[PDB]
Design a protein around this motif. Sequence first.
Motif, PDB file in Angstrom:
ATOM      1  N   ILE A  43      26.565 -10.510   2.508  1.00  0.00           N
ATOM      2  CA  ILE A  43      27.703 -11.321   2.001  1.00  0.00           C
ATOM      3  C   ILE A  43      27.314 -12.670   1.443  1.00  0.00           C
ATOM      4  CG2 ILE A  43      29.373 -10.052   3.387  1.00  0.00           C
ATOM      5  CD1 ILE A  43      29.724 -12.350   5.264  1.00  0.00           C
ATOM      6  N   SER A  92      39.485 -16.851   7.795  1.00  0.00           N
ATOM      7  CA  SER A  92      38.534 -15.761   7.623  1.00  0.00           C
ATOM      8  C   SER A  92      39.216 -14.414   7.521  1.00  0.00           C
ATOM      9  CB  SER A  92      37.470 -15.834   8.749  1.00  0.00           C
ATOM     10  OG  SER A  92      38.000 -15.668  10.039  1.00  0.00           O
ATOM     11  N   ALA A 111      41.016 -14.030   4.126  1.00  0.00           N
ATOM     12  CA  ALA A 111      40.089 -13.483   3.107  1.00  0.00           C
ATOM     13  C   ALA A 111      39.981 -11.968   3.218  1.00  0.00           C
ATOM     14  CB  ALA A 111      38.711 -14.164   3.175  1.00  0.00           C
ATOM     15  N   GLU A 142      41.354  -9.072   0.456  1.00  0.00           N
ATOM     16  CA  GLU A 142      40.422  -8.021   0.006  1.00  0.00           C
ATOM     17  C   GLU A 142      40.972  -6.630   0.237  1.00  0.00           C
ATOM     18  OE1 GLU A 142      36.958  -9.578  -1.017  1.00  0.00           O
ATOM     19  OE2 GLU A 142      37.908  -8.112  -2.429  1.00  0.00           O
ATOM     20  N   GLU A 201      33.237 -20.401   1.804  1.00  0.00           N
ATOM     21  CA  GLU A 201      33.373 -19.149   1.059  1.00  0.00           C
ATOM     22  C   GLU A 201      34.639 -18.363   1.352  1.00  0.00           C
ATOM     23  OE1 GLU A 201      30.594 -20.241   2.562  1.00  0.00           O
ATOM     24  OE2 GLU A 201      28.901 -19.969   1.188  1.00  0.00           O
ATOM     25  N   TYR A 202      35.095 -18.395   2.595  1.00  0.00           N
ATOM     26  CA  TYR A 202      36.297 -17.622   2.928  1.00  0.00           C
ATOM     27  C   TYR A 202      37.500 -18.112   2.120  1.00  0.00           C
ATOM     28  CZ  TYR A 202      34.024 -15.462   6.921  1.00  0.00           C
ATOM     29  OH  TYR A 202      33.188 -14.725   7.727  1.00  0.00           O
ATOM     30  N   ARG A 239      37.763 -19.125  -0.835  1.00  0.00           N
ATOM     31  CA  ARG A 239      37.731 -18.680  -2.215  1.00  0.00           C
ATOM     32  C   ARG A 239      37.630 -17.171  -2.381  1.00  0.00           C
ATOM     33  N   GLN A 240      37.282 -16.435  -1.323  1.00  0.00           N
ATOM     34  CA  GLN A 240      37.096 -14.977  -1.425  1.00  0.00           C
ATOM     35  C   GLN A 240      38.360 -14.232  -1.815  1.00  0.00           C
ATOM     36  OE1 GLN A 240      35.598 -13.203   2.191  1.00  0.00           O
ATOM     37  NE2 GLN A 240      33.450 -13.768   1.765  1.00  0.00           N
ATOM     38  N   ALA A 241      38.196 -13.187  -2.609  1.00  0.00           N
ATOM     39  CA  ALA A 241      39.299 -12.258  -2.946  1.00  0.00           C
ATOM     40  C   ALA A 241      40.541 -12.945  -3.502  1.00  0.00           C
ATOM     41  CB  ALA A 241      39.662 -11.379  -1.739  1.00  0.00           C
TER      42      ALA A 241
END
Lengths: 186, 186, 186, 186, 186, 186
Positions: free
Chosen positions: A29, A87, A90, A94, A180-181, A183-185
């Motif tokens: 990841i 978290s 995210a 997804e 990162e979480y 901005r993810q998905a």
Amino acid sequence: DRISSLPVPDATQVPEGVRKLWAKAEANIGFVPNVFRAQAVNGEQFLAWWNYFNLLLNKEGYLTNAERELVAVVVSGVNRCLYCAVSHGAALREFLGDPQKADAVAVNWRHADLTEREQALAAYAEKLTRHPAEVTAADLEPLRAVGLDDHQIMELVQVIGMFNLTNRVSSALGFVPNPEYYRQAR
Amino acid sequence: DRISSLPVPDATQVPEGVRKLWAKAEANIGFVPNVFRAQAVNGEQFLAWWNYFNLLLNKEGYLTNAERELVAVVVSGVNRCLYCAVSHGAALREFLGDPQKADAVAVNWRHADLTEREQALAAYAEKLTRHPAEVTAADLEPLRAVGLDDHQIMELVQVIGMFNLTNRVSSALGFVPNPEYYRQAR
Amino acid sequence: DRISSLPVPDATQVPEGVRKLWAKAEANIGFVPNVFRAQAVNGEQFLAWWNYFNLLLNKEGYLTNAERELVAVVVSGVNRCLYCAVSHGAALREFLGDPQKADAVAVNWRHADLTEREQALAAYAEKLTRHPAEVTAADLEPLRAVGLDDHQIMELVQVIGMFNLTNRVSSALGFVPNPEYYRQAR
Amino acid sequence: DRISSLPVPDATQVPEGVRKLWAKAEANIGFVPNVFRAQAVNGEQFLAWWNYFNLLLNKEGYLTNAERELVAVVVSGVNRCLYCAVSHGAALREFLGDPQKADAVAVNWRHADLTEREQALAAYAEKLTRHPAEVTAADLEPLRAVGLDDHQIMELVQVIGMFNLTNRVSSALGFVPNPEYYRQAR
Amino acid sequence: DRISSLPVPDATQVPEGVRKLWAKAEANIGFVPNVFRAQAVNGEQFLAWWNYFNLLLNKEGYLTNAERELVAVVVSGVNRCLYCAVSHGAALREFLGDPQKADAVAVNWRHADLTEREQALAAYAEKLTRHPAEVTAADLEPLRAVGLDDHQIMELVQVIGMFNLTNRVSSALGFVPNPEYYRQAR
Amino acid sequence: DRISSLPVPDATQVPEGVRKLWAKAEANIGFVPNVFRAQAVNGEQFLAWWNYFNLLLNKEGYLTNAERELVAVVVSGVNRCLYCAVSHGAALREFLGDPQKADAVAVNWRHADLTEREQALAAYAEKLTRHPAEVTAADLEPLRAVGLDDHQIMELVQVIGMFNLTNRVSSALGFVPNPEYYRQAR
């Protein structure tokens, strides 16, 4: 930039299994989830926790990852746990492939336009989170009516219990979710 | 006769590891804990839960068994969970060698004449259980004032978490504690 | 397609002032906020509400836009109001230039690493929102300690009030935020 | 004899509209409501608030003054706001022409022997005041069943929201209601 | 016409002691309190309750009548009990000789400009009423700081208790206060 | 070994009736209940309290001692009063002849496998204890449906009110139950 209210062990202070998990996360990841560092203070306990958490949330079972992350987001939203909200938010974005639905569940599932089944799961997650003294066998009936069998119920109640565990550990110790979480998905 | 709101698997419907656990229990305590049957509905999830629970609660760690069971009893009392209040009550009575003290903690630790250290543990357990959104780093300071180090805090928060998980699973599924627990260590 | 639990008036069913507002919005932000349609059911009441809301939240006053939107996000989060959490989340992301900070405030300001001043604002917003019967003059002292003067306090209490009004109207009537808000300033 | 936790602006420190309101009140009711002085700290914001409040509560709309003041008294009683309880209690006694009914509503509407419609209004006011995260479209159905149309609902939810705003501003800033209100319409 | 959710016994259905009490009331205050009828369903229990209530609330003890009625009004207000809020409101108005002060205490003692001693009494009454599980010996220290001795504390806690008993009996059974109470001492 | 947060009067500081009660208890049960000493600070008030309590709980009336002690245990468990939980727990174990059922009621009646009637009593006790502002005449209907008449209801609501009184007095003043209660009827 602190990620915990307790000291965070370095590579020399964690067992092999934790270092292997760090490596695996980085390779697959592109970052190491901060919980894998901050919650590694007690190494063997961490590894036992991960073993159960990973089986229940990430490996095949009786609920889909979408269903599981829906519950995660509801429980973590009720308990206002930052690490877990961010978290698992995210993760839900997804697995639903619908960022706005996931965001809406994070605020209030009643207003997120969920399916009947999803509503039954969210409602029961919130009830068992807020009012554990008040749940009874009667509350299982709506779950069966949207098609959950005994294994699905057994899994559901564990996932709700689990987020009541992780929300508490994460909040008590000021765990900070990775950039990162957020901005993810999206 | 009922020990659960879900069907209970017999020996043929659980994995071998669960059968081995039942035999170990019978040999060590003289009976099989009802949770080992009722919660074995999802066998591999059950064994992963047990691995973590046993390590955190029963095996050597950073808190004493008396300290862990005090926290168990506070949490299970606040959440009004029958299975856990009864069975961990038995455990606390055994580890304190004081049934009346354990019984008092079951109602209200504030009135049980505890040590300063025990009061800090009990107060934090109740707060983290009732008000997970409101705990902060400041709440760790009283724990440090009674001598808890980082490993002890890390264990503590997991124990409180774990009872918030098990209280929910046991109450959600109507788990019934064995009659033996009501009589032990009295 | 639904944006409200009540019928939504079209252009022919609102006063001219509402039509002018829609045009101004479209020209300034590129779309018409759904609240400007759904809440225009009683047209003159809508325009009086808008006059006050716009002045207190959008026009120059005694608090910054970042400060006002922080309070908006805290309040709407505590009350779990979808319309306001989503739309003011967008606003806070814009005014902080920090989406992750805004997202963290949306879950729990206690864990968002805020300035002392922001923490005082957020803490007071949450208390006044949850425990209106228990606030006293003593609760103003922390506000004064972070530099709020009388005009700033006067504005603050109105902003907290206003979100307690809009969270209720929007949740009561099932107002749905525009898809654009979920994506802005990310 | 303080009427506010903040300084109260004098005639030289308020805009024309506020001084005109003072004069109008004095001439017509024989005193100046303290809120018109204490909440005038931010003059333009005050005038915008009054413009909306006066339209919604005092000028013709879709609910009667009796219905509106019933809601005011219920919300203000739940939130235990002194300024608003005392002043809207005087209004409700006047509009009902029944001081004892109004007093009983101030304590608990369930025990005040209200009409079916009045009970529906009081119940919904209390629910939206206490549990804004929990109201849904289903809660509008009882309101329609006692004859409220969409405009009446739109007005109702604003009046409830409004008292959630004014209760908060009044309580936060220690606003003191005039002696005259306690004796009016008795 | 209803004064209770249960049938009300007439003169022939109560013991002689209750008839004597009715006559004493009529002669002293000019009417028979409705509770003396509605709560006489179990006659001997009624007379034992009255013996204790009269002694604790009406006869000489360690707190003044004003102090006792302040506590009555705080408790009955928190619990939203119509019978007790109305009738003890009358009593507090009489003993303070200040209807507006009594009316303010009925809404929120925090805003009623009370003496330090009265604030200590009111604050403790509310806590013991709302949070009985959380009071401790530390909570007695403010009472001692305003001059309450052991007999005064002993009386205080019984008065708070007693209103928690009478608020429940009166609300459970829908007891309706006499119209006279709303008008007395105004 | 303290039994109270206030001084406990000796034989020279209590009236005859209290000394006679001490003697009677000693002769018949082999110890003096600590409440008879700790709550004797105000002697006449104590004697009036005992007169009513003894009639309502111990002497013949309309509910059985089992029914009454069931209510006592439920209320005292909700309020987490140690003195009352421990002492009425002993009573309930005695009157049910089933220690484990009594222990289970102390934790959570919903999980204790009670009769329909017992469940109706426990549920109503808990509701009137937790939510006195919310009970209405409608809540009496389930009580009538499990066969309670008006005298039984009148008695029931007094017993619930009474434990709301005694829980508060006992907790406020740190009353400690005698060691004998913990071992009785096991």
